[PDB]
Amino acid sequence: KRQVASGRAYIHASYNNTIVTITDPDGNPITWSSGGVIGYKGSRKGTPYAAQLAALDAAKKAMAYGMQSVDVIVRGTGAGREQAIRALQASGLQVKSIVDDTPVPHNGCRPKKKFR
Amino acid sequence: ARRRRAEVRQLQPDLVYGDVLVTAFINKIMRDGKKNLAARIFYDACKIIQEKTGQEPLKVFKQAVENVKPRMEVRSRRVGGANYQVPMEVSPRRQQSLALRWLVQAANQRPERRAAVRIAHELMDAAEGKGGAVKKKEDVERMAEANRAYAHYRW
Amino acid sequence: KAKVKATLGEFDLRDYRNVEVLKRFLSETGKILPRRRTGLSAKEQRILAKTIKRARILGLLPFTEKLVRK
RNA sequence: GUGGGAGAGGGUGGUGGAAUUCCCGGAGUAGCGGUGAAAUGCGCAGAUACCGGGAGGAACGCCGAUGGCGAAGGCAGCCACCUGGUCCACCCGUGACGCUGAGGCGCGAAAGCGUGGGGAGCAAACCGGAUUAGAUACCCGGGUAGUCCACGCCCUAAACGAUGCGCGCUAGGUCUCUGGGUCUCCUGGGGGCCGAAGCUAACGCGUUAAGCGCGCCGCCUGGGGAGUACGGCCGCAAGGC
Ligand SMILES: [Mg+2]
Ligand SMILES: [Mg+2]
Ligand SMILES: [Mg+2]
Ligand SMILES: [Mg+2]
Ligand SMILES: [Mg+2]
Ligand SMILES: [Mg+2]
Ligand SMILES: [Mg+2]
Ligand SMILES: [Mg+2]
Ligand SMILES: [Mg+2]
Ligand SMILES: [Mg+2]
Ligand SMILES: [Mg+2]
Ligand SMILES: [Mg+2]
Ligand SMILES: [Mg+2]
Ligand SMILES: [Mg+2]
Ligand SMILES: [Mg+2]
Ligand SMILES: [Mg+2]
Ligand SMILES: [Mg+2]
Ligand SMILES: [Mg+2]
Ligand SMILES: [Mg+2]
Ligand SMILES: [Mg+2]
Ligand SMILES: [Mg+2]
Ligand SMILES: [Mg+2]
Ligand SMILES: [Mg+2]
Ligand SMILES: [Mg+2]
Ligand SMILES: [Mg+2]
Ligand SMILES: [Mg+2]
Ligand SMILES: [Mg+2]
Ligand SMILES: [Mg+2]
Ligand SMILES: [Mg+2]
Ligand SMILES: [Mg+2]
Ligand SMILES: [Mg+2]
Ligand SMILES: [Mg+2]
Ligand SMILES: [Mg+2]
Ligand SMILES: [Mg+2]
Ligand SMILES: [Mg+2]
Ligand SMILES: [Mg+2]
Ligand SMILES: [Mg+2]
Ligand SMILES: [Mg+2]
Ligand SMILES: [Mg+2]
Ligand SMILES: [Mg+2]
Ligand SMILES: [Mg+2]
Ligand SMILES: [Mg+2]
Ligand SMILES: [Mg+2]
Ligand SMILES: [Mg+2]
Ligand SMILES: [Mg+2]
Ligand SMILES: [Mg+2]
Ligand SMILES: [Mg+2]
Ligand SMILES: [Mg+2]
Ligand SMILES: [Mg+2]
Ligand SMILES: [Mg+2]
Ligand SMILES: [Mg+2]
Ligand SMILES: [Mg+2]
Ligand SMILES: [Mg+2]
Ligand SMILES: [Mg+2]
Ligand SMILES: [Mg+2]
Ligand SMILES: [Mg+2]
Ligand SMILES: [Mg+2]
Ligand SMILES: [Mg+2]
Ligand SMILES: [Mg+2]
Ligand SMILES: [Mg+2]
Ligand SMILES: [Mg+2]
Ligand SMILES: [Mg+2]
Ligand SMILES: [Mg+2]
Ligand SMILES: [Mg+2]
Ligand SMILES: [Mg+2]
Ligand SMILES: [Mg+2]
Ligand SMILES: [Mg+2]
Ligand SMILES: [Mg+2]
Ligand SMILES: [Mg+2]
Ligand SMILES: [Mg+2]
Ligand SMILES: [Mg+2]
Ligand SMILES: [Mg+2]
Ligand SMILES: [Mg+2]
Ligand SMILES: [Mg+2]
Ligand SMILES: [Mg+2]
Ligand SMILES: [Mg+2]
Ligand SMILES: [Mg+2]
Ligand SMILES: [Mg+2]
Ligand SMILES: [Mg+2]
């Protein structure tokens, strides 16, 4: 009900899940999907297959609002990070550009024991 | 086969059809090393398929074997504790042994009394897309594309 | 590949305000390139690091950037 | 003395961007999170993911080094002021003014103590969830002291090169930081690696000695009992010598 037709797709890939948000060119989201939004429940969310179906579900959801062009933004290291992009290219949405914007601190906050 | 590649056995061409796939199918019918009995089964089963159907038993045999070939299957692989059913393609050689073994196994699950009756009826049903053997094939390709979530463990 | 000192003129390593040459020392991201890629000496690199950080506070050099690939 | 040098050496004030958390707004649904699997947890009072604004605390990515500085502990954003050590060139000045150093005095990571602040992230204890034969644990979700600041204590350490300080002497080769030079190189002062002679039980050390000598301080004399008991000094206590 908006007819945006061009916008951004953020891929948030972590080792436990991949989730995709699709926004208008000034950043406000339109639709979204994830490994949990499609059927998967447990550790299967952080699989590349889930990443595929997640990207594709958010892709078809953005078709409804009439999207064609997409600027891909990627954050995180995770399985199916590449597998989710490859899904977005094939989804029919023309992929304008791809940028990796993973936030790395300049060593400011003490990490949980897991990450030291 | 730890050292070598374990070359494939080259079977004798058929006495009747001159086809090696026939002999290989005859051998799966054989039990206790009675190849004479197992041939008379298959060939008498070719009379059945060619009378009850006005077609060439050779082409139906192949067309049946083709419909039972599985394009994918699942195997197990030990990963982080308990293992997983991993989908992966089927070698063209393994599609041979599996389709042939399944056809013989399916036909002997059949109601029909005599052996050659069961072979012919199975081959016919298999070539038409039904019958017990095509079930084992359609059920295997269902394991893959269900565990499709583990296509990254290809190995 | 070439090194940055190899393809450049005679420049002031201490002038924090000259962006055209200082920009040639950052990477695709705002990162300060290693000596392997700047061709600088041990002492020259120490001076570059400090001048680049000065230019970053004046708003002339970027602290970090976004990679357009992958 | 003069003229030059390099440096996360110290103290004080100021300041910059990235990131985490929290709050405000926008947009936006059904989950997020987490693991070997999970579950507790959080989410329809709208989370996660996304854009914008703000607050606050802590630590400085790249540069970054096998690098540098310091007596040791230890020292990394940037700026300014106050300040210590140190090296080189000149051969100018004093004229043995030196070395070490029981006692004393000061410094002394982390943890811990007191008083008053601060409190984002992390996190003993603790509260849960899992695992398990059990789980007083490893893994997961929370979380207080604490970690940070000021002022005052505490004085331990694998405080390690497990190698006290200074001086002289005894093949070289090679990598390096920083000076000076008539700048393939020479010559100092550091930091490394091979290795002459020699030493060493062996490993190994070898112009940065574990070689050859000299001066001075500390210290050892089988293991357990035991860094315990007693006494003394110190400490608010923990405790230390
Ligand atoms: Mg998961
Ligand atoms: Mg960090
Ligand atoms: Mg910390
Ligand atoms: Mg940190
Ligand atoms: Mg780690
Ligand atoms: Mg993380
Ligand atoms: Mg990391
Ligand atoms: Mg890592
Ligand atoms: Mg670490
Ligand atoms: Mg790490
Ligand atoms: Mg086992
Ligand atoms: Mg197993
Ligand atoms: Mg199993
Ligand atoms: Mg399994
Ligand atoms: Mg003079
Ligand atoms: Mg300093
Ligand atoms: Mg300072
Ligand atoms: Mg300071
Ligand atoms: Mg909100
Ligand atoms: Mg639920
Ligand atoms: Mg939570
Ligand atoms: Mg909570
Ligand atoms: Mg609820
Ligand atoms: Mg609930
Ligand atoms: Mg924000
Ligand atoms: Mg606050
Ligand atoms: Mg980092
Ligand atoms: Mg880092
Ligand atoms: Mg580094
Ligand atoms: Mg570093
Ligand atoms: Mg060092
Ligand atoms: Mg030093
Ligand atoms: Mg140390
Ligand atoms: Mg000074
Ligand atoms: Mg004189
Ligand atoms: Mg005189
Ligand atoms: Mg005299
Ligand atoms: Mg003394
Ligand atoms: Mg005194
Ligand atoms: Mg102390
Ligand atoms: Mg402390
Ligand atoms: Mg305190
Ligand atoms: Mg925590
Ligand atoms: Mg915890
Ligand atoms: Mg057990
Ligand atoms: Mg600390
Ligand atoms: Mg130490
Ligand atoms: Mg000893
Ligand atoms: Mg000792
Ligand atoms: Mg000496
Ligand atoms: Mg020179
Ligand atoms: Mg030297
Ligand atoms: Mg060598
Ligand atoms: Mg060697
Ligand atoms: Mg050699
Ligand atoms: Mg020798
Ligand atoms: Mg020896
Ligand atoms: Mg030896
Ligand atoms: Mg050696
Ligand atoms: Mg000498
Ligand atoms: Mg000596
Ligand atoms: Mg003693
Ligand atoms: Mg004794
Ligand atoms: Mg004993
Ligand atoms: Mg003992
Ligand atoms: Mg004992
Ligand atoms: Mg004992
Ligand atoms: Mg003892
Ligand atoms: Mg003992
Ligand atoms: Mg004891
Ligand atoms: Mg004794
Ligand atoms: Mg003790
Ligand atoms: Mg006594
Ligand atoms: Mg006592
Ligand atoms: Mg007392
Ligand atoms: Mg007590
Ligand atoms: Mg106690
Ligand atoms: Mg004690
Ligand atoms: Mg005691």
3-state secondary structure chain A: CCCCCEEEEEEEEECCEEEEEEECCCCCEEEEEECCCCCCCCHHHHCHHHHHHHHHHHHHHHHHCCCCEEEEEEECCCCCHHHHHHHHHHCCCEEEEEEECCCCCCCCCCCCHHHC
Q: What are phi and psi of B131, to 5 degrees?
A: 90, 165
Q: Can you tell me the distance from the alpha carbon of A112 to that of B46, in angstroms, rounded to the nearest whole number?
A: 73
3-state SS assignment for residue B76: strand
Residues recorded for chain A: 116
Mention every residue, 6+ apart, whose C-beta is less than 8 A from residue B75: B85, B86, B88
Contact present, A65 and A2 (Cβ < 8 Å)? yes
DSSP, res B85: E
Q: Containing domain of residue B86, as a range? A: 1-155
3-state SS assignment for residue C35: helix
Q: How far is the CA of A14 from the centre of ligand 9 (A)?
A: 19
Q: Can you tell me the distance from the alpha carbon of B133 to that of B46, in angstroms, rounded to the nearest whole number?
A: 18
Gap from C11 CA to D183 C1', in Å? 23
Q: Can you tell me the distance from the alpha carbon of C40 to that of C6, in angstroms, rounded to the nearest whole number?
A: 9
The H or E element that residue B74 is part of is strand B72-77
Report strand pairing: A17-23 vs A29-34: antiparallel
Q: Can you tell me the distance from the alpha carbon of C55 to that of C20, in angstroms, rounded to the nearest whole number?
A: 12
Contact present, A62 and A30 (Cβ < 8 Å)? yes
Q: Can you tell me the distance from the alpha carbon of C69 to that of B93, in angstroms, rounded to the nearest whole number?
A: 42
Q: Among A99, A101, A105, which residue's Cα sits nearest to residue A85?
A: A99
* Cβ <8 Å between A48 and B150: no
Q: Can you tell me the distance from the alpha carbon of B26 to that of B31, in angstroms, rounded to the nearest whole number?
A: 10
Q: Containing domain of residue A104, as a range? A: 1-116
Neighbours of chain B (3+ CB pairs under 8 A): A
Gap from C41 CA to D186 C1', in Å? 22
Report strand pairing: A6-14 vs B84-89: unpaired
Q: A61 vs A75, A81, A94, CA distance in Å?
A: 21, 20, 15
CATH of the domain at B86: 1.10.455.10
The structure's method of determination equals X-ray
Q: Can you tell me the distance from the alpha carbon of B94 to that of B116, in angstroms, rounded to the nearest whole number?
A: 25
Interface test with A, best of B145, B152, B154 (most A CBs within 10 A): B152
CATH of the domain at A30: 3.30.420.80
- Rounded to 5°, angle at Cα A88 from A85 and A89: 90
The total number of structural domains in chain B stands at: 1
3-state SS assignment for residue B84: strand
Q: How far apart are the first and last CA of chain C?
A: 22
Q: Please check whether strand D approaches the CB of A46 to within 7 Å.
A: yes
The total number of structural domains in chain C stands at: 1
Helix axes B20-29, B35-51, angle to 10 degrees: 110
Task: Name the nucleotide nearest A2; use CA and C1'.
Answer: D27
Contact present, B77 and B86 (Cβ < 8 Å)? yes
DSSP, res B150: G
Residues having C-beta closer than 5 Å to ion ligand 4: A 107
Chain A positions in Cβ-Cβ contact with residue B85 (cut-off 8 Å)? none
Resolution in A: 3.4
3-state SS assignment for residue C19: helix
Mention every residue, 6+ apart, whose C-beta is less than 8 A from residue C59: none
**B149 inside 8 A of chain A by CB:** yes
Residues recorded for chain C: 70
Using a 7 Å CB cutoff, list residues 74-103 of A near strand D.
75, 103
Q: Containing domain of residue C19, as a range? A: 1-70
The total number of structural domains in chain A stands at: 1
Chain C positions in Cβ-Cβ contact with residue A102 (cut-off 8 Å)? none
DSSP, res B152: T
For chains B and C, tell me whether 3 or more CB atom pairs sit within 8 A of each other.
no
- CB-CB neighbours of B51 under 10 Å: 10
* Cβ <8 Å between C70 and A98: yes
Exposed / middle / buried, residue B103 (Cβ in 10 Å: 0-12, 13-18, 19+): buried
